[PDB]
Ligand binder design. Structure first.
Ligand SMILES: CCCCCO[C@@H]1O[C@H](CO)[C@@H](O)[C@H](O[C@H]2O[C@H](CO)[C@@H](O)[C@H](O)[C@@H]2O[C@H]2O[C@H](CO)[C@@H](O)[C@H](O)[C@@H]2O)[C@@H]1O
Ligand SMILES: CCCCCO[C@@H]1O[C@H](CO)[C@@H](O)[C@H](O[C@H]2O[C@H](CO)[C@@H](O)[C@H](O)[C@@H]2O[C@H]2O[C@H](CO)[C@@H](O)[C@H](O)[C@@H]2O)[C@@H]1O
Ligand SMILES: [Mg+2]
Lengths: 101, 101
C-alpha cells in the first residue's frame, strides 16, 4: 500500500494537508491533496494511522437529497441494516473545497 | 460546523468518495471531493462521524525528506514531544490522485 513518493514530486505539508504532483497511469501528471486530519491520530504523543471500517463493512452508498448519505451496514449480529447520516453535520465548504471538521 | 449543502450543487457519492461543486468565498466555483473512507465509521450498523485529535493536539507539522510527516504532539500528560510518521505506509498515488489506503 502507500508509496506515493516513488511516483510523485514537489510535495508539501500545510497544517494537516498534504499536496503533491503525481504521475498518472497515462504518462502525464496531476496535483491533488488529501487532508490528514482524519487519516492519522495522536496516541500519547505518537502519530499513528487511524483505521476505519466504512469501506469494509458497509455497502451500496447513495446520496439522498442534497446532503444525506445512505448505505447498508453490518451490525454486531452480522446482518445488514439501512443507515443514514447527514453530511451537513460536519462537511463544510471552505472556499470551494469540501472539508471534514 | 458543516453545512456544505447550503453553497454546493450537484453533489455525488461514489463508493466512499463525495464530490460536489461549491462556491468560492466570492464567485467562482470549484469542484472537489473528499473520501469519506476516513471520516465515517460504522458502529453496530450505524454510520458515525469518526473523531481524530490530530489537529487538536499536535503542531508544527512538516514534511521531512520525501515522505515523513513530523510534528509535536501532546502526551496524555500534556507535554509536547516530537513525533514522526512515514506517509508512504499508506498514502498512495492512485492514477495521479493521493489516496489513503
Ligand atoms: C458567492 C456569494 C457571495 C456572498 C456570500 O458571502 C458569504 O458571507 C460570509 C463572508 O465570508 C461567509 O459566511 C461566506 O463564506 C461562506 O459561504 C461561502 C460560499 O458562498 C464559502 O466559500 C465560505 O467558506 C463560507 O462558507 C461557510 O458557510 C456556508 C453556509 O453559508 C457553508 O455552506 C460552508 O460549509 C461554510 O461553513 C460567504 O463568503
Ligand atoms: C511506460 C510504461 C508504463 C505503463 C503503465 O504501467 C505502470 O507500471 C505498473 C504496471 O504493472 C504499475 O504499477 C504502474 O502504476 C502505478 O503508478 C502510476 C503512476 O506511475 C499511478 O498512476 C497508479 O495509480 C499506480 O501507482 C502505484 O504505484 C506506485 C509504485 O510504483 C506508487 O508510487 C503509488 O503509490 C501506487 O502504489 C504503472 O501503471
Ligand atoms: Mg479518521
Amino acid at each position: 500500500l502507500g508509496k506515493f513518493s516513488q511516483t510523485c514530486y514537489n510535495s508539501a505539508i500545510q497544517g494537516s494537508v498534504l499536496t503533491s504532483t503525481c504521475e498518472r497511469t497515462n504518462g502525464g501528471y496531476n496535483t491533488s491533496s488529501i487532508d490528514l486530519n482524519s487519516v492519522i491520530e495522536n496516541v500519547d504523543g505518537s502519530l499513528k494511522w487511524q483505521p476505519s471500517n466504512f469501506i469494509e463493512t458497509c455497502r451500496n452508498t447513495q446520496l439522498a437529497g442534497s446532503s444525506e448519505l445512505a448505505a447498508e451496514c453490518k451490525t454486531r449480529a452480522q446482518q445488514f441494516v439501512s443507515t443514514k447520516i447527514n453530511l451537513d453535520d460536519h462537511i463544510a465548504n471552505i472556499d470551494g473545497t469540501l472539508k471534514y471538521e
